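dumping this here before i forget
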Amino acid sequence: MLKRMYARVYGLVQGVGFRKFVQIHAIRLGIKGYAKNLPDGSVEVVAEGYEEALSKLLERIKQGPPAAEVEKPDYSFSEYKGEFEDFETY
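structure:
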């Protein structure tokens, strides 16, 4: 029932509050990991927690904050590691 979620978020997702939005919803949902700006203009998200909570975070990711214009995210689930102690942005 624990998983690691990888997600790559595409669209107008930088300069729009996206990483802060992801962290805020992750904290509310008790999820650890990070959100990270990539050089191509997309955003990388790594999240660990209960599958149900990760699924709710993925839905928030698909919507994004008000100014974001999100295009279909790539994502995949893999094994929970417990390497993270909080949720950070970079």
